[PDB]
Design a protein around this ligand. Sequence first.
Ligand SMILES: *[C@@H]1O[C@H](CO)[C@@H](O[C@@H]2O[C@H](CO)[C@@H](O[C@@H]3O[C@H](CO[C@H]4O[C@H](CO)[C@@H](O)[C@H](O[C@H]5O[C@H](CO)[C@@H](O)[C@H](O)[C@@H]5O[C@H]5O[C@H](CO)[C@@H](O)[C@H](O)[C@@H]5O)[C@@H]4O)[C@@H](O)[C@H](O)[C@@H]3O)[C@H](O)[C@H]2NC(C)=O)[C@H](O)[C@H]1NC(C)=O
Ligand SMILES: CNC(=O)C[C@@H](NC(=O)Cn1cnc2ccc(N3CCN(C(C)=O)CC3)cc2c1=O)c1ccc([N+](=O)[O-])cc1
Ligand SMILES: [Ca+2]
Ligand SMILES: [Ca+2]
Ligand SMILES: [Cl-]
Ligand SMILES: [K+]
Ligand code: NA
Ligand SMILES: [Zn+2]
Length: 800
Amino acid sequence: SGSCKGRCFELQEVGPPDCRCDNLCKSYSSCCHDFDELCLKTARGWECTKDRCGEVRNEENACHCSEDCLSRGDCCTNYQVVCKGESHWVDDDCEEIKVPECPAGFVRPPLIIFSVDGFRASYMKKGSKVMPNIEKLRSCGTHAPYMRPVYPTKTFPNLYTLATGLYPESHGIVGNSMYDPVFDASFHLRGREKFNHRWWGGQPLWITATKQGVRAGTFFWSVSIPHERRILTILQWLSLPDNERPSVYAFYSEQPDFSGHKYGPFGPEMTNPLREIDKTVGQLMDGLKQLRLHRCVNVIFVGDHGMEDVTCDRTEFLSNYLTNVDDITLVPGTLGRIRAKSINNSKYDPKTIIAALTCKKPDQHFKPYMKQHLPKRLHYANNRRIEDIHLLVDRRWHVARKPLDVYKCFFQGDHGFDNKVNSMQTVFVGYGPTFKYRTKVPPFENIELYNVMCDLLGLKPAPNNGTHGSLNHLLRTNTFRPTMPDEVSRPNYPGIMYLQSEFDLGCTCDDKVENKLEELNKRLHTKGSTKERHLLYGRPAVLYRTSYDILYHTDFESGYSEIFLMPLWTSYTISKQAEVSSIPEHLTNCVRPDVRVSPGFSQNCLAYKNDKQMSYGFLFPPYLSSSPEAKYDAFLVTNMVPMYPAFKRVWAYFQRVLVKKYASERNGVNVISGPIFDYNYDGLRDTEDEIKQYVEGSSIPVPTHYYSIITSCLDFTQPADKCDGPLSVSSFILPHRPDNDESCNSSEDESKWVEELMKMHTARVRDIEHLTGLDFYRKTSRSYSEILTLKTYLHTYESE
Ligand SMILES: *[C@@H]1O[C@H](CO)[C@@H](O[C@@H]2O[C@H](CO)[C@@H](O[C@@H]3O[C@H](CO[C@H]4O[C@H](CO)[C@@H](O)[C@H](O[C@H]5O[C@H](CO)[C@@H](O)[C@H](O)[C@@H]5O[C@H]5O[C@H](CO)[C@@H](O)[C@H](O)[C@@H]5O)[C@@H]4O)[C@@H](O)[C@H](O)[C@@H]3O)[C@H](O)[C@H]2NC(C)=O)[C@H](O)[C@H]1NC(C)=O
Ligand SMILES: CNC(=O)C[C@@H](NC(=O)Cn1cnc2ccc(N3CCN(C(C)=O)CC3)cc2c1=O)c1ccc([N+](=O)[O-])cc1
Ligand SMILES: [Ca+2]
Ligand SMILES: [Ca+2]
Ligand SMILES: [Cl-]
Ligand SMILES: [K+]
Ligand code: NA
Ligand SMILES: [Zn+2]
């Protein structure tokens, strides 16, 4: 029982049990008794009217229209408009902000993050007639057509990602609700457990800023502080003296999410919440202008996720699938997470639950996954709060445990689904001296903003999942100049060193069936004469310590690892006019030793013969060889990789059918393909002592995934091998699995399911980099910033 007089919304939290007056005291029930009275005034609303102009100051009012209000910094945001003949910010023409236009004493342009909830990307077009303030920021500043959220596309995972640059698996906020089995505790959007710091990892922007001497309070706000008071509080803090005034601010809205859940993303009821949000942006913008800061402050208008049509009747029930549904706990809704109801149960079987949920109903509106089998693009596995069993739920559907969980309809909207889904996409607009003027930028991921916000504030970012430099094109002036990571391992270039009779690999090939214009041509090819043709962007750099060989061939070049006994990468180009052939019958099972590489660093056919589960495929496909003579190169033991027969069905369709179709559609393609090892599902390259599976009785390690990166010219009138402008890329990371249980239609012809599987497993080049320790596109004519943007690109396969 102290007092909040003169202390209203103090930035520093005061020591217990002395009462608090900061923006969080209400959450902790620890405000002074007069907090409401002094700090949450509402009298007379939030607008000046003419009759108030030059009033005698009445300290009980929510805001002021008295002559002294500018000096005090507590005018209603519309004061100068209603009482001084001034115009609303939205009514001013927009004028380029070439330099920061800040009052004396401002050391840097302030950053204000304006965060909207459930603000679906398409609201920017569809709601344009009712959001004039937001439409002005959008067209005058720098904007993307949409921004991709993290998965799950829920509120808390995304807001903390925005603040950290980290995937939820890394920052720890992996859901709106979660259970930590080490804490034996549950975090919920509502309640006080979330106040415990033990849930929150990484280093949020306000901590980064503080550690480096830039003032910034926490971004959290007590729920019962309304939005008009939040704006007035930011505007007040902006009037503090230089030595006390923060440089970063965050405002968060409950809308349009609150209404969208009730009404659907496009319910007629949705127009008003969009109007109210625009009005709030108007208030902030008029207030900034009153403080002469509207050409000084950088403003970020950003959403956390979109919103989809979802109703009670579109719910799948696990009780329709599982006989023993009471033995599980489900995190339900737009995603599913399943764990044992009771830990003291060795009669709980994840494999049997998964099998009972797999392809059981023809139209089944969810798919089960062990978390490590989820598409790697989701980066959703490496945290103990993520249950081993995950259900990816179709857009527009829910999953629930039992029917009484849903009837004990409330809602018409929800969000949470896979982050590639169009309806889950959200918004980004940057406006201010440091952002560009009237500029559209390509869609990008919210994990990249932490770095940009650090650049906006002169800060060195904490280590995070953004790729710093990838968003330099948003900025008029950047403090960050990216440079390529240095190569750690230089390759060996072996010559012909071994005779055939030194190998005992138990391999066979029909190849003895045997000119100097042609023979000199074949040795030129083994020495890299065609390398300009098949390695278009230089060779990848190896960023870790290892031993490997560059191997040249007429059709493909490779980086062959002597430690993993297989290529780390295989690079080749297939022109639009290139032709597909078959494997001649006499070479069906041909494998040939490579006289450049020792028996001791080679795979062997015997292991594959003995391993009754594991077969093999090739990284450069025999099917695409340029000539009957070159085809022999494709059967080298150095081009071979371990592959489950079930996976060979996928890979063979990709190599025999899809590669050629891409070359026809894209006017040639360059392909880089290779294995990935990620047994501990942390998204990062495994070292050799982390490998859990080998081909039986050998040291040949088994990949968890195979990747390919597929590059051509953005201008497809030019061929892939003669491109002088920007590049186009799509990539995938395919799980290397011994069954096709993921694909419910896999009994059918590959043309009915393979491409669908690959699209699900689409990836950024940067994801493959993390997973292999390789750095691509080292030698192009493109700027490094442009290449970094290319490496973060995801081909989504969604409609427009
Ligand atoms: C996305 O970007 C992040 C950030 O760069 C990368 O994460 C880093 O990975 C490296 C290599 O695996 C880790 O290094 C290890 O660090 C530990 C000591 O770790 C402690 O100290 C660090 C640094 O101050 C701290 O950040 C760590 O925080 C983890 O654990 C906390 C509590 O246990 C938790 O609150 C927090 O969320 C975080 O959890 C996550 O990471 C851990 C692994 O560290 C993991 O078990 C957990 O499930 C979560 O995923 C920690 O207290 C050394 O002893 C090791 O030898 C090793 O050097 C970094 O710790 C790690 N940092 C963070 C913030 O996660 C990702 O790899 C990158 N992803 C991709 C795909 O590139
Ligand atoms: C309209 N929407 C909003 O206002 C969104 C806003 N919601 C809240 O702040 C709701 N709330 C209310 N009182 C709290 C009191 C204490 C805490 N702990 C958390 C852990 N601590 C740390 C880590 O410092 C100490 C403080 C949290 C809260 C809290 O979440 C929000 C902003 C940023 C982020 N974000 O994730 O960045 C998430 C959530
Ligand atoms: Ca939200
Ligand atoms: Ca790993
Ligand atoms: Cl959740
Ligand atoms: K076999
Ligand atoms: Na199947
Ligand atoms: Zn919501």
